[PDB]
Amino acid sequence: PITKEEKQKVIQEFARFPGDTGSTEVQVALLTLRINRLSEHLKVHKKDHHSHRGLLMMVGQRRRLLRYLQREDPERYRALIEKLGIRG
Amino acid sequence: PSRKAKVKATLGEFDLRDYRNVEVLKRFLSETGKILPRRRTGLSAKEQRILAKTIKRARILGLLPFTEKLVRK
Amino acid sequence: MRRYEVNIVLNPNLDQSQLALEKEIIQRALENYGARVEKVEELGLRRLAYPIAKDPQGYFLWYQVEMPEDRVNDLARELRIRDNVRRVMVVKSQEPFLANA
Amino acid sequence: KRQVASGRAYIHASYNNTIVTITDPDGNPITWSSGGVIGYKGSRKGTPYAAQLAALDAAKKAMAYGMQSVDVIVRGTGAGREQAIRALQASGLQVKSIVDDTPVPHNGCRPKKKFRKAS
RNA sequence: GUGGGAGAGGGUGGUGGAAUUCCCGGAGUAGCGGUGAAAUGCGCAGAUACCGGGAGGAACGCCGAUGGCGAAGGCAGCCACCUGGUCCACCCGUGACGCUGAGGCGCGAAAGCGUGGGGAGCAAACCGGAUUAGAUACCCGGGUAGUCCACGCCCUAAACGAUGCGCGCUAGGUCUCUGGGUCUCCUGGGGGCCGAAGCUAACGCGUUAAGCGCGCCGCCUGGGGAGUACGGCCGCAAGGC
Ligand SMILES: [K+]
Ligand SMILES: [K+]
Ligand SMILES: [Mg+2]
Ligand SMILES: [Mg+2]
Ligand SMILES: [Mg+2]
Ligand SMILES: [Mg+2]
Ligand SMILES: [Mg+2]
Ligand SMILES: [Mg+2]
Ligand SMILES: [Mg+2]
Ligand SMILES: [Mg+2]
Ligand SMILES: [Mg+2]
Ligand SMILES: [Mg+2]
Ligand SMILES: [Mg+2]
Ligand SMILES: [Mg+2]
Ligand SMILES: [Mg+2]
Ligand SMILES: [Mg+2]
Ligand SMILES: [Mg+2]
Ligand SMILES: [Mg+2]
Ligand SMILES: [Mg+2]
Ligand SMILES: [Mg+2]
Ligand SMILES: [Mg+2]
Ligand SMILES: [Mg+2]
Ligand SMILES: [Mg+2]
Ligand SMILES: [Mg+2]
Ligand SMILES: [Mg+2]
Ligand SMILES: [Mg+2]
Ligand SMILES: [Mg+2]
Ligand SMILES: [Mg+2]
Ligand SMILES: [Mg+2]
Ligand SMILES: [Mg+2]
Ligand SMILES: [Mg+2]
Ligand SMILES: [Mg+2]
Ligand SMILES: [Mg+2]
Known about the structure:
The structure is cut from a larger assembly and holds chains A, B, C and D.
Chain A: H1 4-12, H2 24-41, H3 49-72, H4 74-84
Helix pairs in contact in A: 2-3, 2-4, 3-4
Chain C: E1 2-3, E2 6-10, H1 18-31, E3 37-46, E4 58-67, H2 72-79, E5 85-90, E6 98-99
Antiparallel strand pairs in C: 1-4, 2-4, 2-5, 3-4
Chain D: E1 8-13, E2 18-23, E3 29-33, H1 48-63, E4 69-75, H2 81-89, E5 94-100
Parallel strand pairs in D: 1-4, 4-5
Antiparallel strand pairs in D: 1-2, 2-3
Chain D binds one RNA strand through residues 8, 10-12, 14, 16-17, 19-24, 26-32, 34, 36-37, 41-43, 45, 73, 75, 103-114, 116.
Subunit structure (chain C): Part of the 30S ribosomal subunit. Forms a tight heterodimer with protein bS18. May make transient contacts with protein uL2 of the 50S subunit during translation.
Function (chain C): Located on the outer edge of the platform on the body of the 30S subunit.
Protein name (chain C): Small ribosomal subunit protein bS6
């Protein structure tokens, strides 16, 4: 799944500054994480349709953010994407 | 109606998550291995749900009865 | 690692020879899958509520371990071959939820 | 003439008839009676009365093998089931203990239409 | 975000006992079965009832609720792994990043279609037995598709709360599921019942609105003709929109 430890690493190496647990940058990071996890989960269990929904919800929940960012700080944006390998 | 004084009361404190305490567990089955209904067991939706759970386990471990022949009819 | 519990009921009609041998198989295969002994109980023989494998009685073993989840099932599939091993039930440990305390 | 003494008497209540079977201390039948055996045919066979004699006609055939005591075991719900149980009691035979053991399944086979609106 | 919670939410592998059928053995006779009453059917090649053994398939008794989960369709034996949603507390990070949502895309009970496998029980069609004025039926005896699994199609429904989604506002009482607290009680989320104000053609609704408001979508415009014809798009077909 995602051990309390595992999740920090992400945040840590993302939080725009100490205690930053909840900034667009961060959020997107974790989303991605989860998303990727689930995705490979659906590489198998192609019939786990109920889990698949959650995927879309995530994916969209992500775009709604990315969209925000890119519109607000077009730089923080490029930054973030250029890091995850998201979109191509 | 039921005038038999629920189980629980006639019992100490135990772990409902214990699928090996035959002596205590056993106490929750009817003459037949049937899992006693709350109106008798004397627990809560939450307990009565954790009970049945462990009981079923014990059975697989062959420590409790799936069913019993009713004596005297 | 995840804390489990490996209940094992094996043939009652044995002896310190094979019986020991089974532990000398079981106890091995465990470590062959990363099994980690935390505490073992051996209530030995007892009268099953219903006959399992024709016989009306079983020898119960117990093994509280902390092995690698990814191979739990792999551990059970294996432990099952032993013909004397008539029942295997692994179940991740939970804190004992008491009632009427 | 094998001599039995003690034994088992299985009652089989059906809504259509009531076979009663007597067997040695552990399975293996000895004698038995039905509703036709005695004499009836159609729905007659089930009548609690038939159930009676049925238990009885199976009572004698039993004593003849040297029957004295019996463990009664009932199966299925049906007319005169209690009759039979009641018969065997006043059959001159020793009725050790009645015990119901009807076969109830933990739900597995789809029942005939006739037994589903009930299910 | 951190820290707790409940759950038949989904996918996979495994596994348990009850029962039905069948095969093997015993023991054992003359019936069984089924109905309103019967008959077809089964049984001396030995059935039904009983006992022990095996094989197989499908469904999980009690627990079980007026209960729980899900977006819907729907989801109950047990275990492990993978995985989704959700609730409470703390009020810690972001700083309006929000709501709705044409088209699109995905999901979607049952039956049905394609390929392969499986096939205990049940059973359209079907073959018989009864019934009746007749019986292409209801009852009874058999029985193929199908029902079960994999993969791929089908996309419909009284797909119902016959009630689109989101937010704010407006008495309470009571029962309940689940979390937190200073735990005769307060507070949060969910499931019910009764009822304030109000609404409603009425029945009824009534903080789980059908009340008072705002935003966005879908839809309606007298019956029949007809969910038909034509056209298009979709489908292997049946058919669907
Ligand atoms: K319900
Ligand atoms: K057309
Ligand atoms: Mg700015
Ligand atoms: Mg004949
Ligand atoms: Mg077969
Ligand atoms: Mg709902
Ligand atoms: Mg429904
Ligand atoms: Mg979760
Ligand atoms: Mg703050
Ligand atoms: Mg600030
Ligand atoms: Mg939307
Ligand atoms: Mg749409
Ligand atoms: Mg189907
Ligand atoms: Mg098919
Ligand atoms: Mg006919
Ligand atoms: Mg007529
Ligand atoms: Mg009519
Ligand atoms: Mg028929
Ligand atoms: Mg049939
Ligand atoms: Mg479908
Ligand atoms: Mg209407
Ligand atoms: Mg209320
Ligand atoms: Mg409390
Ligand atoms: Mg409430
Ligand atoms: Mg009123
Ligand atoms: Mg009024
Ligand atoms: Mg009301
Ligand atoms: Mg018109
Ligand atoms: Mg029309
Ligand atoms: Mg019209
Ligand atoms: Mg149509
Ligand atoms: Mg075409
Ligand atoms: Mg049609």
